[PDB]
Design an enzyme around this catalytic site. Structure first.
Site, PDB file in Angstrom:
ATOM      1  N   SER A 256       0.817  -1.203   0.000  1.00 26.39           N
ATOM      2  CA  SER A 256       0.000   0.000   0.000  1.00 26.39           C
ATOM      3  C   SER A 256       0.867   1.276   0.000  1.00 26.39           C
ATOM      4  O   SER A 256       1.726   1.435  -0.875  1.00 26.39           O
ATOM      5  CB  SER A 256      -0.994  -0.076   1.140  1.00 26.39           C
ATOM      6  OG  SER A 256      -2.081   0.824   0.888  1.00 26.39           O
TER       7      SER A 256
ATOM      8  N   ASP B 278      -9.747  -3.861  -5.932  1.00 30.42           N
ATOM      9  CA  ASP B 278      -8.965  -2.892  -5.181  1.00 30.42           C
ATOM     10  C   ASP B 278      -8.960  -1.620  -6.025  1.00 30.42           C
ATOM     11  O   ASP B 278      -8.640  -1.729  -7.196  1.00 30.42           O
ATOM     12  CB  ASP B 278      -7.547  -3.428  -4.945  1.00 30.42           C
ATOM     13  CG  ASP B 278      -6.548  -2.477  -4.304  1.00 30.42           C
ATOM     14  OD1 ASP B 278      -6.924  -1.313  -4.039  1.00 30.42           O
ATOM     15  OD2 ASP B 278      -5.420  -2.947  -4.024  1.00 30.42           O
TER      16      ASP B 278
ATOM     17  N   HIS C 109      -7.677  -5.128  -1.454  1.00 29.48           N
ATOM     18  CA  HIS C 109      -6.569  -4.379  -0.873  1.00 29.48           C
ATOM     19  C   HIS C 109      -6.274  -4.898   0.540  1.00 29.48           C
ATOM     20  O   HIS C 109      -7.170  -5.166   1.341  1.00 29.48           O
ATOM     21  CB  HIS C 109      -6.910  -2.880  -0.782  1.00 29.48           C
ATOM     22  CG  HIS C 109      -5.714  -2.022  -0.553  1.00 29.48           C
ATOM     23  ND1 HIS C 109      -4.885  -1.671  -1.603  1.00 29.48           N
ATOM     24  CD2 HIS C 109      -5.200  -1.465   0.566  1.00 29.48           C
ATOM     25  CE1 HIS C 109      -3.884  -0.939  -1.097  1.00 29.48           C
ATOM     26  NE2 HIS C 109      -4.044  -0.792   0.200  1.00 29.48           N
TER      27      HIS C 109
END
Length: 298
Positions: free
Chosen positions: A148, A242, A272
């Protein structure tokens, strides 16, 4: 492709101040680790002197050392949340499965520290690790990694490496944020209800960036960089469902077309965050992907 069944169950069972939001993120991580305990692993806490101050690290030592480069890992959390403890479940597994020494970095969080402070810190720690590596019996070239926001950092550190005289052998990007300027189809299609949402991402940007214009700075949005030639070999792992999927996959394609050895793996049915969510077997599948990829580096 359908949503993975366990993911769908997770999403269905989901239900303040900055301090409280940070604590809630940390509680969630603890709960997942209680559900699926991490492997035991030897660790050593330390502090690295950076240009922006002391940064705490944790070095993970595998039972059996098999990989010849140190990994330097930068946790996710939107630049605002997370720490070494929130990402221990992932890092412990990377360490033991790959058989690699890993340095997990507690970089400075926003909004207290703003862009580009953690980028600077992350470079500094990478440089430190490259200098220590021979004394650990390893090659000086490092592998950077992160999920991320941490994947953003790894990607930026990789783009800066040559200019910073930092030897980097590979980059491992786990559903990274890479382009804060452009909307992609996935950013529209999966904006809400898949854990990482549009409104949160906006807020994270407001905390991290100094002004709206920072979105176009390549150290914020590394996908905007026009020259990707000569960058380190890249593993880019995405989740099908995502908002950040498309920018991660587009960057992988761009790296590949720039001659960078690139492996691009989309985990179908996933969301995600799945590589810090050990309730999903795909987390360990993706860690196997990392090991297989790193086998090919030397």
């Amino acid at each position: 492709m359908p949503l993975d069944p366990r993911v769908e169950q997770f999403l269905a069972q989901m239900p303040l101040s900055l301090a409280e939001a940070r604590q809630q993120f940390k509680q969630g991580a603890l709960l997942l680790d209680q559900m699926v305990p991490p492997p035991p692993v030897d660790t050593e806490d330390g502090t690295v002197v950076t240009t922006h101050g002391p940064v705490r690290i944790r070095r993970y030592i595998p039972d059996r050392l098999r990989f010849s480069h140190p990994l330097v890992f930068y946790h996710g959390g939107g630049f605002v949340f997370g720490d070494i403890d929130t990402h221990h479940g992932l890092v412990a597994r990377l360490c033991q499965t790959v058989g690699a020494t890993v340095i997990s970095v507690d970089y400075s969080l926003a909004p207290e520290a703003k862009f580009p402070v953690p980028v600077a810190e992350c470079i500094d720690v990478a440089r430190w690790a490259a200098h220590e590596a021979p004394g650990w019996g390893l090659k000086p070239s490092i592998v950077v990694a992160g999920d991320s926001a941490g994947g953003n950092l790894a990607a930026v550190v990789s783009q800066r490496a040559k200019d910073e005289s930092l030897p980097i052998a590979a980059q491992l990007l786990f559903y990274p944020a890479l382009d804060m300027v452009h909307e992609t189809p996935s950013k529209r299609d999966f904006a809400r209800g898949y854990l990482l949402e549009a409104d949160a991402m906006q807020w994270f940007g407001e905390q991290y960036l100094r002004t709206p214009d920072d979105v176009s700075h390549p150290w914020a949005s590394p996908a905007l960089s026009p020259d990707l030639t000569g960058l380190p070999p890249a593993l880019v792992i995405t989740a099908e469902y995502d908002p950040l999927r498309d920018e991660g996959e587009a960057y992988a394609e761009a790296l590949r077309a720039a001659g960078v050895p690139t492996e691009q793996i989309r985990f179908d049915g996933m969301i995600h965050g799945f590589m810090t969510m050990p309730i999903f077997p795909q987390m360990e599948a993706a860690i196997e992907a990392v090991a297989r990829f790193l086998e090919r580096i030397d």
